[PDB]
Design a protein around this ligand. Structure first.
Ligand SMILES: CC(=O)N[C@@H]1[C@@H](O)[C@H](O[C@@H]2O[C@H](CO)[C@@H](O)[C@H](O)[C@H]2NC(C)=O)[C@@H](CO)O[C@H]1O
Ligand SMILES: [Ca+2]
Length: 209
């Protein structure tokens, strides 16, 4: 019923990142759509990181299985599942494209229809969440280059919010997660600041007076 609210002061910038354990050298599960969509959720959580506006990275240190990822030291980039979630806000109306390029090892992207809101005095509550059907699934062929560039373009309405989830797996060595946004102007962005948000929780007893 409401796809927006006057008061959205509880919206804050950035993807929420969750990093999970993944067995080093496992080149099977990176190709398994059930694992990439749901199965990873059963693994031990290694890190939780908020406020991420630049989600892409390309990391390979032959001398260390850890690296600084999203400002956090000693992240086990060598073998991990990364889950990024948030609400994508269209600024202007038009076609927006999300592209995954040369991913090492694999990535699956989910991008939902517009979320409805419950509007409260202290901010807005998105009602819509866990888009469950993937749009894009890209996998680096074992031991050869990932030449794949895969994209999803859809029309977004100005000011509306669209839940998004991206799952990325590195099985071993290089972690290449190249995730870009093309906006209706044609500009290609690696920085999602002012497009990607979370909504802070609020006391639902005091939603209204
Ligand atoms: C059989 C073997 O060891 N081949 C080497 C490749 O593994 C290696 O590329 C690696 O492929 C993995 C599986 O697709 C990737 O997860 C991993 O990130 C990647 N490693 C790097 C450093 O890119 C290539 C790299 O040239 O060398 C082969 O000899
Ligand atoms: Ca890899």
């Amino acid at each position: 019923t409401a796809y927006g609210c006057d008061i959205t002061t509880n919206a804050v910038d950035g993807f929420d990142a969750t990093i999970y354990q993944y067995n080093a050298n496992d080149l099977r599960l990176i190709r398994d759509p059930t694992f990439m969509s749901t199965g990873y959720l059963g693994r031990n959580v290694l890190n939780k990181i908020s406020g991420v506006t630049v989600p892409g990275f390309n990391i390979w240190n032959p001398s260390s299985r850890t690296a600084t990822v999203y400002g956090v030291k000693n992240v086990n980039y060598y073998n991990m599942v990364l889950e990024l979630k948030g609400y994508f806000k269209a600024d202007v109306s038009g076609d927006y494209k999300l592209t995954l390029s040369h991913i090492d090892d694999s990535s699956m992207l989910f991008f939902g229809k517009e979320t409805a809101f419950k509007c409260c005095d202290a901010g807005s509550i998105p009602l819509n969440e866990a888009p469950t059907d993937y749009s894009l699934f890209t996998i680096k062929p074992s031991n050869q280059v990932n030449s794949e560039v895969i994209s999803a373009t859809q029309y977004l309405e100005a000011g509306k919010y669209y839940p998004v989830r991206i799952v990325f797996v590195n099985a071993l060595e290089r972690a290449r997660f190249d995730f870009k946004l093309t906006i209706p102007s044609g500009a290609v962005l690696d920085d999602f600041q002012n497009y990607i948000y979370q909504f802070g929780d609020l006391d639902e007893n005091s939603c209204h007076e």
